[PDB]
Amino acid sequence: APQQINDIVHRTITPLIEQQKIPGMAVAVIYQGKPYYFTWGYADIAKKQPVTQQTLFELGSVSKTFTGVLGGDAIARGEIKLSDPTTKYWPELTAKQWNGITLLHLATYTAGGLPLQVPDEVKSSSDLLRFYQNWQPAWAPGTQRLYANSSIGLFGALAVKPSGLSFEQAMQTRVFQPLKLNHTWINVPPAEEKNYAWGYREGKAVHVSPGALDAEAYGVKSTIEDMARWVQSNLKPLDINEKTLQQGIQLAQSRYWQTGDMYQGLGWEMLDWPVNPDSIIALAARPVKAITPPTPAVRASWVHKTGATGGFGSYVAFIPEKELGIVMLANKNYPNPARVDAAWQILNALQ
Numbered sequence: 001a002p003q004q005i006n007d008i009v010h011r012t013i014t015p016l017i018e019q020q021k022i023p024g025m026a027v028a029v030i031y032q033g034k035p036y037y038f039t040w041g042y043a044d045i046a047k048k049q050p051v052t053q054q055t056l057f058e059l060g061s062v063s064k065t066f067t068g069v070l071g072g073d074a075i076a077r078g079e080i081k082l083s084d085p086t087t088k089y090w091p092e093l094t095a096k097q098w099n100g101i102t103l104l105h106l107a108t109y110t111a112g113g114l115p116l117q118v119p120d121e122v123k124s125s126s127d128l129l130r131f132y133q134n135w136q137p138a139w140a141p142g143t144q145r146l147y148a149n150s151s152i153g154l155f156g157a158l159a160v161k162p163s164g165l166s167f168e169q170a171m172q173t174r175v176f177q178p179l180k181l182n183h184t185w186i187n188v189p190p191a192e193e194k195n196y197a198w199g200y201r202e203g204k205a206v207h208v209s210p211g212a213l214d215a216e217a218y219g220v221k222s223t224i225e226d227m228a229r230w231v232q233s234n235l236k237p238l239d240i241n242e243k244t245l246q247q248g249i250q251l252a253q254s255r256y257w258q259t260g261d262m263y264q265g266l267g268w269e270m271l272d273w274p275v276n277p278d279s280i281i282a283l284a285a286r287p288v289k290a291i292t293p294p295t296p297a298v299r300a301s302w303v304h305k306t307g308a309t310g311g312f313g314s315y316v317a318f319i320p321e322k323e324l325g326i327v328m329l330a331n332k333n334y335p336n337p338a339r340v341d342a343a344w345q346i347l348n349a350l351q
């Protein structure tokens, strides 16, 4: 643990934890390709269990990066194409508004205003069909971006249908296992419950509740060690031996749409490096410019994703051209600007 990394991390994170009243936190810094770990505070306040390198945190929407990569892998296998109509994999979706909506639109939140949340009343496969049949787009496909669990979640469910595998089994066999993410779960097994942190909302201990498309949109739980490995894999995809997975990682970092200074990948979001830190709301509708054709993964990028659940707040950011990255996992959902500011202070100091 180089003293420079130790100092910048502790001097940034200790006051962050104090100002945001974060019960427990884990951080990983990837520096020239090697990981360094830091932990603070409590995974379980009532039982006085500390955060360790083996503590499981809810990733929330950082799960979408896994979904994006899994979709990329299915593309590289020739099982799906992003230019395919949604109805090719869901022929029961017969309502006319779906004409022209492709898997790419689902993956990138550009289908025309699919909502942020699947309603709680929607549980079954027939419930889901009915919800998507009744949905009325506000916009033509590929004209505006609206961040939505119901968009990329449906992409994830459809992308695995040609494989014959359940979404969870596809994610285990095709992403977690090849990358040796052996403590990363869509469903936490009983054997691992001792390591599953509690989230804290309004001082109450909480875990994410089941929902439709939860696995695909916000369902992953992981340790700081596995998340460091995830960052390493996304920094250097060419070191990965599985060919379609290497390609799927590259596809998830391609630039498909631009809004302002940001580019939309599959799960991942990207900005050009170096980034103005100030350049990095319940509903924010933004017009998008198509990138025709998509730009292949730009090594000189700030690639990132925020994530939240009711009780958890996560952030991942990395810069491929510098072999540099960071993961911040906390069991309180605290404001996104504070996450990005801390991450930028650390990475800027080290670059």
Ligand SMILES: Cc1nc2cc(Cl)c(NS(=O)(=O)c3cccc(Cl)c3O)cc2s1
Pocket: 059, 060, 061, 062, 149, 208, 217, 218, 306, 307, 308, 309, 310, 333
């Ligand atoms: C009071 C709250 N309850 C929940 C429950 C969940 Cl499941 C999520 N996760 S999310 O996938 O839908 C999500 C949505 C928008 C932004 C982010 Cl960064 C995110 O992760 C967030 C919150 S906030």
